[PDB]
């Protein structure tokens, strides 16, 4: 069973694609990824959010060139439960019609 969808739908699933790729994972494309999951952190303090924040933009302009990115943010209001949730509100540059999307990156043990 298939459905069609329209180019909105396919670059939220890009934005998610990207984001949850380790650079590396793509044996054909090593390149391909966001540099989050090459970073271990003994503290999250908010200039850490920040650097956060960082690594996602630069994942999507690099990745993903149908947006243009409005804001990121880091969020701790999940943390509780062992999540920073990522608050991403873009442009779809071929309709300027903007979305928000919430990735969750999920804290766990180094090792």
Known sequence: ???????????????????????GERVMRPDFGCGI????F????????????????????LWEPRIELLSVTASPREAAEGRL?????????????RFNLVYPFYLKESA
Request: hydrophobic share 45%.
């Open 1 to 23: 069973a298939m459905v069609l969808s329209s180019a909105e739908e396919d670059i939220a699933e890009s934005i998610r694609i990207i984001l949850g790729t380790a650079r």
């Open 85 to 97: 949730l990522i608050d991403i509100e873009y442009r779809v540059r071929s309709t300027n019609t």
């Open 42 to 61: 003994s503290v999250i303090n908010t200039t850490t959010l920040g650097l956060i924040e960082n690594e996602v933009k630069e994942a999507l302009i």
């Open 37 to 40: 999951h090459d970073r271990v």
